[model samples]
Target: TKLTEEEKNRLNFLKKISQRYQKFALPQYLK
Candidate 1:
């Protein structure tokens, strides 16, 4: 699942990092 808007809105970096990573190393993104 995607990160929450509550935190992502608080910090743009936080969202990008996680979002980018999720898309990159997603071999077992959800499992």
Candidate 2:
């Protein structure tokens, strides 16, 4: 399936957000 430009950007944006959240949360989560 091909994503439109907006969909591609949206996925990239959300993926970045998820990565940022993991970075912020995982440390406290392990401690």
Candidate 3:
């Protein structure tokens, strides 16, 4: 099964937020 455009948009939004979180927390993880 494939995702619709709307579903893909939502997934991309989630991915962006997760990546932003990981980036912001990278320093904490390294310490």
| TM-score of each prediction | 0.27, 0.45, 0.41
Which RMSD values do the candidates have, in order?
7.6, 5.8, 5.7
Per-residue alpha-carbon lDDT of candidate 1 for residues 1-31, written as tens digits (9 for 90 to 100): 3558666565877656777677666665466
Ranking 1 against 2 by lDDT, winner: 2
Q: Model 2 Cα displacement at 22 (Å)?
A: 4.5
For residues 1-31, write the lDDT of model 3, one tens digit per residue: 3568879888889777777777666654557
Q: Point out where model 1 deviates above 4 Å.
A: 1-10, 22-31
Q: Candidates ranked by lDDT, best first?
A: 2, 3, 1
Span of ten consecutive residues with least summed lDDT in model 2:
22-31
Clashing pairs in 2: none
lDDT of 1 at 5: 69
On residues 1-31, what C-alpha lDDT tens digit does candidate 2 reach at each position?
4569889898889777877777655654555
| Candidate 2 wrong stretches, greater than 4 Å | 1-3, 22-31
Candidate 3, poorest ten consecutive residues by summed lDDT: 21-30
Q: Which residue pairs clash in candidate 1?
A: none
Candidate 1 C-alpha RMSD relative to the actual structure: 7.6
The deviation in Å at residue 22 for candidate 1 is: 4.2
